Ligand binder design. Structure first.
Ligand SMILES: *Cc1c(COP(=O)(O)O)cnc(C)c1O
Ligand SMILES: *Cc1c(COP(=O)(O)O)cnc(C)c1O
Lengths: 344, 344
């Protein structure tokens, strides 16, 4: 019974219904042709083999010899690699400096403008929120920026869909991506892609031969424990997003608590996400004398029914407060206090 | 307790060890960096999000403005769609005519020659065996053809790896693909890709930024119930391939049995694969008077603990004899005999 705090898993905590559902192993059509689009607040929605898989879909789908794409400096690495695999020139829109590391809609506007000078920017993309500091840029404004520049906007909602309530039509962006195995409590490699219909005959184009298969996805009907789980949990996730406010509240408390404890949280302040990135000079000093040194932390927690931090990290690290019940939160806060006093 | 005969599943029958393995949910490095390459008899091997996923990998990875690719007329539809998604011109090498529908290394040679006249054939591909009739072309010879033409050969072993023993180095082709969820007793969307090392810095190229991630796969470490199952069953599959001879024997018997029964098996004769495609004019006639008509078959079998044939098909259909124990085979043969006499 390990209290998990790893970001990559608090949101992908597999549902009971989906757990059982995997044992015995459908409205698939109903799902992706009704439920799903409604949930992402958008016209067309499809299920892909993961977010990065969808992110590439549209990139490959709109790329152009010597074209460009603008993505925030906090872009997940798959957003960047999948740009490369599309052969796109990539321009990063710079982040604020410590402790903000924020993606301002203004820098975006410039980046987008500076780039265009260099060529055609076939696409724009913001990681909302970035998996780094848990920062939630101002898409509503950014999406405005992109629209008054005629450069499609893809939102990497990998860390928002399945957690916080979101709607493509709300935001005003053109595309939207989600990851079922980290935010939607699903399993295996699976993802969700949403778009304005206008971009269907573009991305969702069919083969010449097999008029029924969609080329950009390889005519995949992706049946497998993947969707199975995703669907099974979906009802849960539907209701889940309602408590977002308590989740941000909680993560906020745990945050300032750490504050008093001598370790700081950078980025959004107040923060707006269970995923927070901390600076703990103290734990770094200790690590210089501490038992295992660089690993004294992992050691200390792995011995307190706690795990979720890349073992070896003491100075900087990130963590989620998502599933964590107030008591589990407190327990974790206390856990820190202890390890602090322990070493001098 | 349904005796399954569907091709898409006899080989993907999930293993016990892998079944349990999914419950509780590693030498991953050991697997893909030792076991796997050894098993496919090749230098480099990687695990992808499915065969079609790998098939595209190399296609995208070697494509070229206005380039070409030659694939057998029996090519699975994903081999064709994934060619389209790479933007490749596609040239099909014609199959023999009823009842052979065979891919002769000679037509290949011509197709490859005829095409080159039209441009550069960056790649060649044979489905070994095709998922249509279960035909096993003469790759050893075809692979020779391609080599004396300097056109890389990708083998779509979707239906051979995990069933029959195979070795890239044996065949002499450049690439090799397999599907874990239909031949390797795995789950979800997963696949295996194998190649001569010379094609690594090509396909397995890393991003500029993330020097550790491989661009052609999106730096995916594809951890998930996918690999988990695949690995868990692998030991089993390793030994499985040894009985191939009894499998072809069995499927051969069941075949000629159907022969006496008035329904014929086209393609390889003797056939060389548990997957066989049959012609049953008789069942077609019956369907014209029979109870449910076009569905009288599905009806008749769904009522005899048997399923695995696209309901509606009576005139033509395909089936696997893979998992089926002699008695299950016999039972199925008898089942047919019965439904035959039943209707006049
Ligand atoms: C994990 C992650 C992804 C990739 O998710 P997949 O479904 O495995 O491709 C993309 N973006 C962010 C911000 C992530 O954290
Ligand atoms: C099913 C099949 C494929 C596709 O397998 P995936 O792993 O789902 O992409 C490819 N080739 C053949 C011959 C098949 O039968």
């Amino acid at each position: 019974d390990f209290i998990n705090i790893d970001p990559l898993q608090t949101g992908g905590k597999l549902t009971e219904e989906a757990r059982q559902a995997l044992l015995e192993w459908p409205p698939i059509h109903d799902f992706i042709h009704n439920q799903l689009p409604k949930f992402l607040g958008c016209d067309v929605a499809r299920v892909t083999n993961g977010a990065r898989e969808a992110k590439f879909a549209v990139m490959h789908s709109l790329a152009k010899k010597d074209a460009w794409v603008v993505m925030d400096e906090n872009c997940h690495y798959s957003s960047y690699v999948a740009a490369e695999r599309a052969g796109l020139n990539i321009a990063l829109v710079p982040k604020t400096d410590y402790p903000d590391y924020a993606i301002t809609p203004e820098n975006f506007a410039q980046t987008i403008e500076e780039t265009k000078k260099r060529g055609e920017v076939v696409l724009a993309l913001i990681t909302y929120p970035d998996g780094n500091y848990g920062n939630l840029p101002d898409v509503k404004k950014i999406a405005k920026v992109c629209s008054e520049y005629d450069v499609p906007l893809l939102v990497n909602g990998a860390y928002a869909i399945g957690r916080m309530p979101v709607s493509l039509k709300e935001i005003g962006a053109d595309f939207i991506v989600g990851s079922g195995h980290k935010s939607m409590a699903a399993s295996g490699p699976i993802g969700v892609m949403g778009m304005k219909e206008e971009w269907a005959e573009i991305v969702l184009r069919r083969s010449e031969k097999y008029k029924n298969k969609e080329v950009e996805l390889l005519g995949c009907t992706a049946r497998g424990a993947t969707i199975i789980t995703l669907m099974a949990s979906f009802p849960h996730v539907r209701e889940r997003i309602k408590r977002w406010d308590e989740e941000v509240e909680k993560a906020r408390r745990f945050a300032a608590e750490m504050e008093k404890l001598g370790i700081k949280q950078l980025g959004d302040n107040p923060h707006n996400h269970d995923l927070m990135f901390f600076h703990a000079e103290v734990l770094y000093e200790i690590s210089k004398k501490a038992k295992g040194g660089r690993f004294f932390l992992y050691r200390e927690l792995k011995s307190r029914k706690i795990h979720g931090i890349k073992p070896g990290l003491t100075r900087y690290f990130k963590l989620s407060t998502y599933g964590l019940s107030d008591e589990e939160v407190d327990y974790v806060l206390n856990a820190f206090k202890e390890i602090i006093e322990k070493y001098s």
